[PDB]
């Protein structure tokens, strides 16, 4: 009789995959990660 | 009689996927993450 | 009858992946982890 | 002037993707990865 | 002037994601990783 | 001039992700890691 997570949860579990391959010169971006703030993930700003 | 997140539960969980393969220079930018932010995700700004 | 996570909780526990495999010269930016904060993420500012 | 794979090369980088979201009692089965091998791939076997 | 694998080079890079996310009793399988061999992939056997 | 794999190079480097995520009773099995090998993957057996 158990409750997993229910009532006014907020059940917030996804799987989020950011996969970038390459041959060559790499000089640009590949961003991943949650980032979940105000102009999150690094970058070049 | 078990309750998986009935109720007003908010049940987010679903699959994100990003993927970008490349052969040669690679100077731009491929974005995944979930970035749950105002201008969320790096990039250049 | 346990209680996972029940009531009034915010359950947050997804998987994030950030991946970048490269052949070459690699001068760019892969940026993943969580970075929850603003202007968050190790970049170049 | 730079070769990139050029020749004989045999180039193979695509994206190759397998997403399952359920909700519920899940005992089947999700199969994703390469599996280059006969027989390949974990299953019940 | 460079050779990025070029003339009988075997260049496999690929992007290989497998996702599965569930709400509740999870008894079955979710198969991911490479398995190059025989029989690969750890499975019930 | 450099020569990244060029020639007869196996260059073999690819991005494999195995993602699970799940809320509640969990007794089944999720597989990942690369099993280079007969019956490989850790499993039942």
Same mark, same amino acid.
């Given at each position: 009789? @158990? /409750? %997993? =997570?229910?009532?006014?949860?907020? &059940?917030?579990?996804?799987?989020?995959?950011?996969?970038? @391959? /390459? %041959? =060559?010169?790499?000089?640009?971006? &590949?961003?991943?990660g949650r980032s979940s703030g105000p102009y999150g993930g690094g970058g070049?700003?």
């Amino acid at each position: 009789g @158990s /409750n %997993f =997570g229910g009532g006014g949860s907020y &059940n917030d579990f996804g799987n989020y995959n950011n996969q970038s @391959s /390459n %041959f =060559g010169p790499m000089k640009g971006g &590949n961003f991943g990660g949650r980032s979940s703030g105000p102009y999150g993930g690094g970058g070049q700003y």
